[PDB]
Amino acid sequence: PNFFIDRPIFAWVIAIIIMLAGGLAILKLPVAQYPTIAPPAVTISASYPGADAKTVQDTVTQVIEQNMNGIDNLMYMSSNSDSTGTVQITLTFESGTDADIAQVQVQNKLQLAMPLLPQEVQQQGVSVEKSSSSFLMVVGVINTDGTMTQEDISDYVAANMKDAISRTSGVGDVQLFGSQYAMRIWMNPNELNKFQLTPVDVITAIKAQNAQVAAGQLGGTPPVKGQQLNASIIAQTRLTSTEEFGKILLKVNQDGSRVLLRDVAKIELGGENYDIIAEFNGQPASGLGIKLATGANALDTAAAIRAELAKMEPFFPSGLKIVYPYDTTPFVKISIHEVVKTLVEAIILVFLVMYLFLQNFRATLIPTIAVPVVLLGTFAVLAAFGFSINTLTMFGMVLAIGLLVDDAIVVVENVERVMAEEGLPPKEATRKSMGQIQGALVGIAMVLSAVFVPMAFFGGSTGAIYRQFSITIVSAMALSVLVALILTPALCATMLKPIAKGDHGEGKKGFFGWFNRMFEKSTHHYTDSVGGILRSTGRYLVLYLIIVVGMAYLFVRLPSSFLPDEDQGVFMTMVQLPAGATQERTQKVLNEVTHYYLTKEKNNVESVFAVNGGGQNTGIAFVSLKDWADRPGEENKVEAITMRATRAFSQIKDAMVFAFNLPAIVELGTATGFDFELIDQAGLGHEKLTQARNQLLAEAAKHPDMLTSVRPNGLEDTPQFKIDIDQEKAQALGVSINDINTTLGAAWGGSYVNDFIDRGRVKKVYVMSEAKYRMLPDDIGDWYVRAADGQMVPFSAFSSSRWEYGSPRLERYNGLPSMEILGQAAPGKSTGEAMELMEQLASKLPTGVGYDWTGMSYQERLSGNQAPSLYAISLIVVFLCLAALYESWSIPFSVMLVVPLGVIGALLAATFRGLTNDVYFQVGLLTTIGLSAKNAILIVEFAKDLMDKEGKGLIEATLDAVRMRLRPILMTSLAFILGVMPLVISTGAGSGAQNAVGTGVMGGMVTATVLAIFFVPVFFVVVRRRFSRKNEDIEHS
Amino acid sequence: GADAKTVQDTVTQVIEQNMNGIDNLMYMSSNSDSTGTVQITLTFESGTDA
Ligand SMILES: CCCCCCCCCCCCO[C@@H]1O[C@H](CO)[C@@H](O[C@H]2O[C@H](CO)[C@@H](O)[C@H](O)[C@H]2O)[C@H](O)[C@H]1O
């Protein structure tokens, strides 16, 4: 400490080093919008072509669910069984488990369930992936001159782009939206009936005439003695053209005429699946979902990708352009550039205050050197603990600017003060003064990390969010202190200009300086009156409690959030059609939306990206917005935008169309809102479970005062068509049940049969009915089976037919049949309360109706008992720290009593600005407690030291302290309030967060000082008047 | 028994294409054989956990 005061250059070297390591941790540091925040989930997705919901549930799912045992750190297992034939089992794991090890554990338990699976499933593939929902980017590809359809493009992507993007550096994963080329063979059932043939033969023939076969080798090993030719055999080669697939022979007739495939069915290169069809401004487009690599730079991955695509552009088909539907990146560009704008500015502000307050250049260059260094160094402290330049850590630094600023200031001010007071040289003034603030600065570090660290040890995804802030902030802080002990004292004693004893630069200059008297006089006024109050303090206790209570009411009556919403230049709208509607009708609506946006939002919307899929019944539309710059208004912002969209599609539409903005943390809890699981426990039936579900919907429909918008999260039972095969009639007339089945299948379901080699890439061979002969129930009739004898038999000869109900989506939670009920709490009431009333209502249900919690309300049912404890620790540790610094159990109470003085402001700040008690308002709120405590501690320190090291009296010593201490206090807070204010009143991108930090902090700061510089004195004085007896107000020694 | 240009765009290239976002991949090189063997070597940054 002192040591450096006598060594300017050694400190210069610790400084130069910190600057360089931070500079390096800057040059080689990851940037991303957020950190990994969400618990790890691994999803097993597989599909069973043609299967219905109970099919996959009873063929694939339950066999997989039962084979999923003994996998490490299981949290919860939830799966969808779809009538679209797809089944997905998401296993979410314990927070901070090794993604990669858990995911390997699952793919190796599945690789054991594999042999107990359907062969259709086993051959379409059962897959394992790690589930983020956070694609860095989604690239679209289109053709301008109407040239190709969706499926053509899908292929172009899968054979020209997906492959070179996953070669773009910075790109961690590529996923594909659409379906690759396939040999699509569409049976015409009549022309099939002619030659007395079935699908089954079509399959057979196709496998037979199309294959590779293990050929072998001429002159193989061992060859015979002397042998001289050694080379490979080329055999039956898989088919290449659609033509060659036409020229495959199905039955050679008697009359010399041959029957080809070309004849019995139509043949075309077509889509592997037509569930999902995608339209970008109406033109057909096919797409890519790119995920950011682990540790990789978001902004550079995206730029490298864009460079990859322009570099491919000299090789494209005509009018085939790349489009960029979703890019989370430029919002991150603006976020980063705006937080830097803040840091630079707030530095410039502190210079401005420091000058227009010490009117002395070389002093004013000191704190300017200081914090930059603390910055750089903290980036380097983060890089050491494995972090990245992301949202949470950067607003952690913005938030930290205050402790940083007060720390540099405290020092240079104390020096200048001691010089103006006693007339010491620069150096000797420093040591006097550094020797005065030393213990205080160390103690403040122990108390500041006494509040800032407990919050790092928060659990769950919530806890993760806190971890980012807490580490950013604490390191910035402890460093601000080591800088304040090594560098600043060194830069003070070395380059600070010496001040004439009893200078105060009063009057003196005119142009620039009338202020000094005017400040001077007033600080006198101030302290006169400080004294003035210290006569009767009682009234001031009255008002104090009043402020406390007011703070309480303000606190409770303020809205509890999780984060703020961000117009990200992009949002989405989702479309729900009447159950069983058509690909084409859903598509009508999606076009309607596409046009609405392309009409009454001509100035804001650049592009609409509609996707029909997940089952004809429902479509979704990705709405992209024009750049922020040409969207000025309060109305050209997403809130009002989605307002008018949903306003449009609510009344004047045929099916439900919500328009919404995606939250910034893309996968956690809607604050007041839960995710209920209604779990069937006993050997019950799906019918009984639904009955229980609507029953609970009713029990909550009875409580509009507690719960709000309680809704199930599934699909209802739709009418499904049942074709009962009478084994007797069919086995009688001569048709093998296999044949009736797989003909019914390969007719209406479709069938993967063979593999063919298109343009050198292996694609699939799908044979199914032509569209028209497999649409309507009566058409069942056009299909016949060749019996054992040789006769064709219609299905109505051995098939009964009826309509029934069934559900398209069979949900399972942790093994058993279950049903997901989403919900949120009433306007007034806390989420947990509504969760509790839900546990009381799901307790009101019939035998076998159990309940459980998942996702959001799980992450909250964990960390709902932790919040008070970390802060009980925080209070015991801060008090212990201050008792340490001083020498008192009771003197601390002076500085702790300050905490409210900042709160009353922040609550008042948000409320009277109409905001909400979120995280940013909280880290900010803490930050405020931090300064309250700092200033108060410096006052109390100076008070005690004057008292003990100069035997001075109480009232007089505190008075003197609060007096010499005022000028810097004001400096600090002036520097802040100005630096923060922009954050409080900015628009453009991200202004939701910015304003969230700002408002709370600012209001807090204001009440903080202009309440402390009157209450702290009274604390120290009134507190001290519950200590010992004799002596006193001594004035001796 | 299959031939090299046969195996390579069906088995080699199809596997290589999925090998992105491999942590610390330095360089990736693979052989496609008419003796039927197909082999893909992934060499990594010095000291990545094998
Ligand atoms: C950076 C600018 C700071 C300077 C501006 C602040 C100066 C004035 C702020 C004072 C706020 C508290 O208000 C102050 O309270 C005490 C009363 O308790 C008054 O003081 C007076 O009243 C009480 C009587 O009840 C007496 O004990 C005391 O003899 C007398 O000083 C002050 O006249 C008043 O100004």
Swiss-Prot record, chain A:
The chain crosses the membrane at residues 9-27, 336-355, 365-384, 391-412, 438-456, 465-489, 538-554, 866-882, 893-912, 919-937, 967-986, 993-1012. Gene3D superfamilies: Multidrug efflux transporter AcrB pore domain, Multidrug efflux transporter AcrB pore domain like, Multidrug efflux transporter AcrB TolC docking domain, DN and DC subdomains, Multidrug efflux transporter AcrB transmembrane domain. One of its GO terms (biological process) is enterobactin transport. Disruption phenotype: Loss of susceptibility to contact-dependent growth inhibition (CDI); inhibiting cells still contact the target. It comes from the Bacteria. It is found in: Cell inner membrane. The keyword Ribonucleoprotein does not apply. One of its GO terms (cellular component) is efflux pump complex. It is a multi-pass membrane protein. Keywords: Cell inner membrane, Cell membrane, Membrane, Transmembrane, Transmembrane helix, Transport. AcrA-AcrB-AcrZ-TolC is a drug efflux protein complex with broad substrate specificity that uses the proton motive force to export substrates. NCBIfam families: 2A0602, PRK15127.1, RND_permease_1. Homotrimer, with large domains that extend into the periplasm, interacts with AcrA and TolC. AcrA may be required to stably link this protein and TolC. Interacts with AcrZ. Part of the AcrA-AcrB-AcrZ-TolC efflux pump. This is Multidrug efflux pump subunit AcrB.
Curated annotation (Swiss-Prot), chain B:
Disruption phenotype: Loss of susceptibility to contact-dependent growth inhibition (CDI); inhibiting cells still contact the target. Belongs to the resistance-nodulation-cell division (RND) (TC 2.A.6) family. It is found in: Cell inner membrane. The chain holds residues 51 to 100 of 1049 of the full protein. It comes from Escherichia coli (strain K12). Homotrimer, with large domains that extend into the periplasm, interacts with AcrA and TolC. AcrA may be required to stably link this protein and TolC. Interacts with AcrZ. Part of the AcrA-AcrB-AcrZ-TolC efflux pump. AcrA-AcrB-AcrZ-TolC is a drug efflux protein complex with broad substrate specificity that uses the proton motive force to export substrates. Induction: Positively regulated by MarA, Rob and SoxS transcriptional regulators (at protein level). This is Multidrug efflux pump subunit AcrB.
